[PDB]
Design a protein around this ligand. Structure first.
Ligand SMILES: CCCCCC(=O)OC[C@H](COP(=O)(O)OC[C@H](N)C(=O)O)OC(=O)CCCCC
Ligand SMILES: CCCCCC(=O)OC[C@H](COP(=O)(O)OC[C@H](N)C(=O)O)OC(=O)CCCCC
Ligand SMILES: [Ca+2]
Ligand SMILES: [Ca+2]
Ligand SMILES: [Ca+2]
Ligand SMILES: [Ca+2]
Ligand SMILES: [Ca+2]
Ligand SMILES: [Ca+2]
Ligand SMILES: [Ca+2]
Ligand SMILES: [Ca+2]
Ligand SMILES: [Ca+2]
Length: 1533
């Protein structure tokens, strides 16, 4: 485990990853789900808290809780967005607590918590679970903690899969400080800090008014904003003004948007936008540093600088996409000063100040040095013909230098001379440069910050080597080359060598005084991080082995993304080089090359990856026009030589070009050797011949309404194009055509031509009837070059066919099995070339085409399910035509699809020559057609089995010890208040424990699956497979209808592919009979009635479908003809419903087998909205060898909560499984044992019924045999247990985002068997009725609120206010103890609080209307908390709140014996007071403190109350009745 390969093994370098659609600016469906659970320790006096949840500009509110500092909400909010990831992660999640909000007055804020979406998305599962948001006053740095809000915050994108923890009972003493809502590394106490965004000056602004500009800089940070003054009429404005924000440190909103804007009274418009990432300019920990930046320049990009009345690329000026032109450069700085909040010498205001910053000079950013940029357009081809045949120039700009139309000694030549295009084909032009390549040269002046670009070049060189190595490892894993773990160890060796090389290279020029603080701190951080990366790579090299390569590759992806993170320099020096295509002086398409990629250095690692090299550029349409249908066509394709560096370093600026050219220079440059040329005239040229072996394609795009295409491939090389033949009605053509590009001319002897060949562009096109063609995708290739002196010999020659990944923009559009070679025509002519062996169409020659071996494909035709309407007519006589590689077989004609969609001949077969390499196997096509009369066959649908590797038969490994089947192996094994919810909650807790164990017994259990049941049992495809038939054109990833709409049916069956010379012992061990073949043990195809019983347990995190933020869910189940819609049993205003339902549907299997369980929002007016649905496909479950009909329980009992559901007893199931599998057994001897095959099981021999007396039985040991059925030697299989699966709910209207989790399970019982009993009572628990009697005896030391108007003595009119469920449903007041001069009150007043209680959830259940106008009663679950308050009664004003205590009825402090022993420490955060539950001790008498918050925001003792809590049931309360207050029965004094 030491040896390694340090060279590329596969041909991944010949398969470029060029894409025309970047991820920048692409909108994507996002969803932020925030579940406000509760709040604690809120700061206020008699507050009615409402939690306001804002994400971005959208805001939602919880319900109002009356008079509590520890409220409980359990309310679910969903915020939906369709924005780009950079916009979405910059949105500010603000969880606030307000009070006194009504229809006209905004609420008074208690505290707020700020964090952005990107901090939530950087979590391990893109979420926080059960974490407490630290509330702080956002308008006061001297204010303390304002409370905590326990909440879940989750962010999901389109296609994200999140393991959400299940909603168990929350009956635990949760820790607030150990579970805060902070990312890891952020301290629990966050100081206040000031963010000085110093803005000095700007340069090179474009035209904005018509013609001047009046710029200012607006800075956005963490939801705050502030702007500088307006510098009127200035292209080079000077502010010297700092925008000072005041915010918590470290900030959880980690990006800052600096944006130059133009002042205008008509419309305020953005000029340019740069985002300062605070991650890249700071580090955390003891070795970290505060966020610092500058004083250094920053380059902003956006739309084109020409003025228009309206700008369709205005979003580029807002930073919402990739900038297509240089807008301005802004000299910028940032400093963070941590404030001392305990010092009253500074103001405590948090408002954004705009002050005068200290001015710094232009020399602080570095001395200006002359930079020389040179370009040479060697090739221009693949120009879009929709631009017209007008003359085409290429204008190169860098900053404003070279922009002679919109921007603002040697004279710079920035544009090529105009050249009229010539036709390549019907879609593309090319410019005929030939021997005369046009050239550009631009003089520019930038500050000398080349050290930053050199360090970024070294880091990106290490990242490029690592990325090429990981792509090599991934590719030769995919193509199954030998020893992938040897290459990855060499990749880690190269990574550690590069990381060690960076430490020796980046220490140069540290003595320069022009370095900023960010330069020094980031150099130290990069040195430390790359040293740790090198040591981690050397440690990970020892862990790379044969079986662990595929996850150390994922670990190396973390090193790759960390290198890409560290390589981005935040202080820009030189703006990016833009290359624009122009015709009729109109900007058409652009490319953007970073200037660090073109920068020249003596050191090889500091050299840019594109400096002194011919770079293949693909110009794209600016802004949104580069995506979608407009960006499909190649706008242009350039082979552009580029060099950038100092003008003192331009001695070797022509060294990377191909040799053999004469420099033709300008008229002022005659006689000067150092003058750059305006053109190159090549005299040397090399003849070449390209062979494009277009053999095959697969999985291609469907561009016709039948779901197929007519593909042909057009191959582009230099300025030439050739086409393959059109193959009709296929998505996997076998073109088998070699395209010979004869007498190609490569101008000049290109350096390293064998290592960097010119790129080949291949475009697939669907031929249509009227001569037009639909774009089907594009792949790229690099030919494997033969020189004239080379021999056409192995191992390099002839080239092997490889799969090239085709892209329809960003989506994958199949693979192209092809090989490309570029053979040089030598001095002897074409006789040195290999010989070339359908008319003029040439086949792929022998040695490149795959060697074929004979196979047999046996097809099981099981049935056809859910065939939709073809055209408008119903399918009635379907037939399945299956074709692979030109051969095939056709199924028996289904003479009537309605009565039985089954095939008379179960298995057919055909023989077909397939390649010896199983990776080169062509896909097999299933094609269902409706056989009408007179030969009028119409296409119903088509499925493409892309890989036959799943269906390839190989003989089983009978040398495994499981098959040995010899030698005996012995395997051994109130209270009546339990229900199904007991075992369900036990299984939920157990599943939580196994999830904790995988990350790092008195109650019998089932198996709770966090996913579907299909996810744990290989989708029940052990013998029967599903093939979704498709029709219609494929939809795009944006504005498409996706694959699920195109499904027009399902074909049921299997495939079995093997080499047709089978050995006779292989065929006999497979049991080949002539009636079926390889498909043995196939069950009966006859129709059978099946009782389907769907138990719906609950749903969690349902998407809101009403205007109040909630929904009214009910269960609608569709199965065959049966369409149950349970609208009468909807649960009102609940997003986490507990259904507890069971539905019985008698379905005719295997026809009515597609089960759809859906959740619908009931609406009083209009149609009921769909929340989500899931498809279960019960046919695969019913016919599986896993026995997914009825789940098998852990232990057997015939009564109670653990009752055996199945009408077949475990002995009958064991007998059936032994009979079907031909296993000798079951052999019951005595009742405590059974022998099945070579294994003997033992267990208990007696069962107990409801009376509890014993009875001998065999069912325990039979169930023990069924639980260990996987260990059976011959036909052993893991049986499906009794389970609750969690199926996600999907909406076609909002695709890709799961918006519900429906927990259920399905039981199936054949009706020819004995019927099952009644369904299980999984209905939710009825709450036990109780009554809490709180006798308020006295009060002591209550504060005196009133003051005497005439004599000044203090007094208080004390009365006690108590409630259990709420102020509007359980409020009871004692009579007023008037005129208390010492705080003593005498009440002897009894409260009565009847309430319904769930013991497991510890929640009071109450049914009440949400409002006065609400249609129905809503079930609410609140914590059982008794609130006792003291008040002062006023005759001519409102009563005054004095103090309160909130006693949680499970965790309240024990009351003191006297009033003197009562202190504040009973109710505050001290742990020294023991806790007492009223549900256990049943009577508590004592004294309790009453607390109120003063204006210093601490708690104070405002009184004490003597109380006697006494909990009974309703049955105990009825047999011992008492009256309210002091009334009979049991009167009080
Ligand atoms: C005039 C008062 C307007 C008040 C605001 C408004 O538009 O209310 C729509 C209401 C409620 O409809 P939903 O709950 O489905 O809307 C919620 C939505 N599905 C969502 O999830 O966003 O519908 C009607 O009034 C009847 C319409 C059809 C009548 C045939
Ligand atoms: C058909 C005759 C009129 C029937 C009017 C009626 O009852 O409308 C229903 C709603 C209240 O009922 P729900 O919110 O439960 O809606 C039910 C369920 N959650 C749903 O989604 O629809 O009425 C208002 O909002 C009126 C507020 C007026 C304030 C002044
Ligand atoms: Ca203006
Ligand atoms: Ca078409
Ligand atoms: Ca077509
Ligand atoms: Ca609705
Ligand atoms: Ca509704
Ligand atoms: Ca509706
Ligand atoms: Ca008063
Ligand atoms: Ca009073
Ligand atoms: Ca008052």
């Amino acid at each position: 485990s030491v040896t390694a390969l340090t060279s590329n093994v596969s041909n991944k370098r010949s398969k470029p990853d060029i894409k025309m659609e970047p991820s920048a600016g692409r909108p994507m469906d996002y969803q932020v789900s925030i579940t406000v659970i509760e709040a604690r320790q809120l700061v206020g006096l008699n507050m009615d808290p409402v939690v306001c949840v804002e994400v971005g500009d959208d805001k939602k509110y919880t319900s109002m809780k009356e008079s509590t500092n520890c409220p409980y909400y359990n309310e679910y909010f969903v915020f939906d967005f369709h924005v780009s990831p950079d916009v979405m992660f910059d949105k500010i999640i603000k969880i606030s607590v307000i009070h006194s909000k009504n229809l006209l007055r905004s609420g008074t804020l208690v505290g707020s918590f700020k964090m952005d979406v990107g901090t939530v998305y950087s979590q391990p599962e893109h979420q926080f679970h059960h974490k407490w948001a630290i509330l702080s006053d956002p308008d006061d740095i001297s204010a303390g903690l304002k409370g905590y809000v326990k909440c879940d915050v989750a962010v999901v994108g389109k296609g994200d899969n999140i393991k959400t923890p299940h909603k168990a009972n929350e009956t635990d003493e949760d820790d607030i400080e150990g579970n805060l809502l902070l990312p890891e590394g952020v301290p629990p106490e966050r100081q206040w800090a000031r963010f000085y965004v110093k803005i000095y000056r700007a340069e090179g602004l474009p035209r904005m008014n018509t013609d001047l500009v009046d710029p200012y800089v607006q800075v956005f940070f963490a939801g705050q904003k502030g702007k500088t003054s307006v510098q009127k009429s200035s292209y080079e404005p000077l502010w010297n003004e700092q925008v000072v924000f005041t915010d918590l440190f470290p900030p959880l909103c980690k990006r800052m948007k600096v944006q130059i804007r133009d002042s205008d009274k008509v419309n305020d418009v953005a000029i340019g936008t740069h985002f300062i990432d605070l991650r890249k300019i700071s580090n955390d920990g003891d070795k970290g540093f505060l966020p610092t930046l500058g004083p250094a320049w920053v380059n902003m990009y956006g739309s084109t600088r020409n003025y228009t009345l309206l700008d369709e690329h205005q979003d580029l000026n807002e930073g919402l996409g990739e900038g297509v032109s240089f807008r301005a450069r802004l000299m910028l700085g940032l400093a963070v000063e941590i404030l001392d909040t305990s010092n009253p010498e500074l103001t405590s205001s948090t408002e954004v100040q705009v002050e005068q910053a200290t001015p710094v000079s232009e020399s602080c950013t570095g001395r200006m040095e002359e930079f020389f940029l040179f370009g040479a357009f060697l090739e221009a081809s693949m120009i879009d013909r929709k631009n017209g045949d007008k003359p085409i120039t290429f204008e190169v700009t860098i900053g404003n230098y070279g922009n002679e139309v919109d921007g603002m000694d040697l004279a710079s030549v920035s544009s090529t001379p105009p050249m009229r295009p010539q036709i390549t084909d019907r879609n593309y032009f090319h410019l005929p440069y030939l021997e005369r390549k046009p050239c550009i040269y631009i003089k520019s002046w930038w500050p000398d910050q080349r050290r930053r670009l050199y360090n970024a070049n070294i880091m990106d060189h290490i990242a490029d080597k690592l990325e090429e190595g990981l792509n090599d490892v991934q590719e030769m894993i995919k193509t199954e080359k030998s020893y992938p773990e040897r290459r990855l160890r060499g990749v880690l060796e190269e990574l550690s060598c590069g990381c060690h090389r960076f430490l020796s290279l980046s220490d140069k020029d540290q003595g320069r005084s022009s370095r900023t603080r960010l330069d020094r701190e980031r150099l130290k951080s990069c040195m430390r991080e790359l040293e740790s990366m090198g040591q981690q790579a050397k440690s990970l090299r020892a862990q790379v082995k044969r079986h662990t390569v595929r996850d150390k590759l994922r670990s190396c992806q973390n090193f790759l993304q960390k290198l890409r993170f560290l390589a981005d320099e935040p202080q820009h020096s030189i703006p990016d080089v833009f290359i624009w295509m122009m015709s009729n002086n109109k900007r058409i398409a652009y490319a953007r090359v970073p200037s660090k990629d073109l920068l020249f250095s003596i050191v090889e690692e500091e050299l840019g990856k594109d400096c002194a090299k011919v770079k293949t550029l693909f110009l794209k349409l600016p802004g949104k026009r580069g995506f979608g249908s407009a960006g499909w066509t190649v706008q242009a394709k350039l082979e552009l030589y580029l060099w950038l560096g100092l003008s003192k370093q331009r001695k070797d600026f022509l060294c990377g070009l191909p040799c053999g050219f004469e420099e033709v220079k300008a008229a002022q440059g005659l006689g000067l050797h150092s003058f750059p040329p305006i053109s190159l005239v090549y005299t040397k040229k090399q003849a070449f011949q390209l062979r494009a072996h277009m053999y095959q394609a697969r999985s291609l795009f469907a561009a016709d309404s039948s779901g197929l295409s007519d593909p042909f491939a057009r191959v582009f090389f230099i300025n030439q194009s050739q086409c393959t033949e059109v193959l009709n009605e296929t998505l996997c053509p076998t073109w088998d055509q070699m395209l010979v590009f004869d007498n190609l001319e490569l101008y000049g002897e290109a350096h390293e031509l064998r290592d960097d060949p010119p790129i080949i562009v291949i475009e697939i096109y669907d031929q249509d009837s009227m001569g037009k063609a639909d774009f089907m995708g594009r792949t790229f290739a690099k030919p494997l070059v033969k020189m004239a002196d080379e021999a056409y010999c192995p191992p390099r020659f002839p080239p092997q066919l490889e799969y090239y990944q085709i892209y329809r923009g960003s989506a994958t559009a199949g693979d192209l099995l092809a090989a490309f070679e570029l053979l040089q025509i030598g001095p002897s002519g074409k006789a040195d070339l290999p010989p070339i062996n359908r008319g003029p169409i040439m086949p792929v020659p022998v040695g490149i085409r795959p060697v074929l071996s004979k196979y047999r494909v046996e097809v099981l035709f099981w049935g056809l399910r859910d065939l939709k309407r073809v055209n408008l007519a119903q399918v009635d006589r379907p037939r399945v035509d299956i074709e692979c590689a030109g051969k095939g077989v056709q199924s028996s004609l289904i003479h009537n699809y309605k009565k039985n969609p089954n095939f008379n001949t179960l298995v057919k077969w055909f023989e077909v020559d397939l390649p010896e390499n199983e990776l080169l196997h062509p896909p097999l096509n299933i094609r269902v057609v409706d056989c009408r009369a007179f030969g009028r066959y119409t296409l119903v649908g088509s499925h493409a089995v892309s890989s036959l590797r799943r269906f390839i038969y190989r003989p089983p490994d009978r040398s495994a010890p499981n098959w040995n089947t010899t030698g005996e192996v012995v395997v051994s094994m109130d209270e009546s208040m339990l229900d199904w919810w007991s075992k369900y909650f036990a299984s939920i807790d157990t599943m939580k424990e196994q999830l904790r164990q995988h990350e790092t017994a008195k109650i019998d259990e089932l198996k709770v699956y966090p996913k579907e049941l299909e996810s744990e049992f290989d989708s029940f495809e052990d013998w029967l497979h599903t093939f979704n038939l498709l029709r219609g054109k494929t939809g795009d990833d944006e504005d498409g209808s996706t694959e699920e709409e195109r499904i027009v049916g399902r074909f049921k069956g299997s495939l079995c592919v093997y080499k047709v010379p089978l050995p006779e012992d292989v065929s006999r061990e497979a049991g080949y009979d002539p009636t079926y073949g390889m498909f043995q043990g196939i069950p009966s195809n006859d129709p059978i009635n099946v009782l389907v019983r769907i138990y719906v347990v609950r749903a969690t995190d349902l998407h809101p479908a009403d205007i109040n933020g909630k929904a009214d869910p009910y269960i609608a189940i569709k199965l065959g003809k049966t369409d149950i819609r349970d609208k009468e049993n909807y649960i009102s205003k609940q997003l986490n419903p507990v259904f507890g339902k069971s539905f019985d549907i008698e379905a005719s299997f295997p026809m009515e087998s597609m089960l759809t369980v859906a959740v619908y929002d009931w609406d009083l007016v209009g149609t009921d909205d769909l929340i989500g649905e899931t498809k279960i496909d019960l046919e695969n479950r019913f016919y599986s060898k896993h026995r997914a009909t009825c789940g098998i329980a852990q232990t057997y009992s015939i009564h109670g909560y653990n009752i055996w559901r199945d009408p077949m007893k475990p002995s009958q199931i064991l007998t059936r499984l032994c009979k079907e599998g031909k296993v000798d057994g079951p052999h019951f001897g005595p009742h405590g044992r059974v022998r099945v095959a070579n294994r003997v099981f033992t267990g208990p021999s007696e069962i107990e019924d409801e009376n509890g007396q014993r009875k001998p039985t065999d069912e325990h040991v039979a169930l023990s045999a069924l639980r260990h059925w996987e260990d059976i030697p011959r036909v052993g299989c893991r049986l499906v247990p009794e389970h609750v699966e969690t199926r996600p709910l999907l909406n076609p209207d909002k695709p890709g985002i799961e918006q519900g989790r429906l927990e259920l399970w399905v039981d199936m019982f054949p009706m020819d068997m004995p019927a099952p009993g009644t369904p299980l009572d999984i209905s939710p628990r009825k709450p036990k009725k109780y009554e809490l009697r709180v006798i308020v005896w006295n009060t002591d030391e209550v504060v005196l609120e009133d003051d005497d108007f005439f004599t000044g003595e203090k007094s208080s009119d004390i009365f006690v206010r108590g409630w259990l469920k709420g102020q509007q449903e359980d409020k009871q007041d004692t009579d007023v103890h008037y005129h208390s001069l010492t705080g003593e009150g005498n009440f002897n007043w009894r409260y009565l609080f009847p309430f319904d209680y769930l013991a497991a959830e510890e929640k009071i259940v109450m049914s009440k209307k949400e409002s006065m106008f609400s249609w129905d009663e809503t079930e609410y679950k609140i914590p059982a908390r008794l609130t006792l308050q003291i008040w002062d009664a006023d005759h001519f004003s409102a009563d005054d709140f004095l103090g309160a205590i909130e006693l949680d009825l499970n965790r309240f402090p024990r009351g003191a014996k006297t009033a003197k022993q009562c202190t504040m420490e009973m109710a505050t955060g001290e742990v020294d007071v023991p806790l007492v539950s009223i549900f256990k001790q049943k009577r508590v008498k004592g004294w309790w403190p009453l607390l109120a918050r003063n204006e210093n925001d601490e708690f104070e003792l405002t009184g004490k109350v003597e109380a006697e809590l006494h909990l009974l049931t309703a049955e105990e309360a009825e047999k011992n009745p008492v009256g309210l207050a002091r009334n009979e029965p049991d009167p009080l004094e």
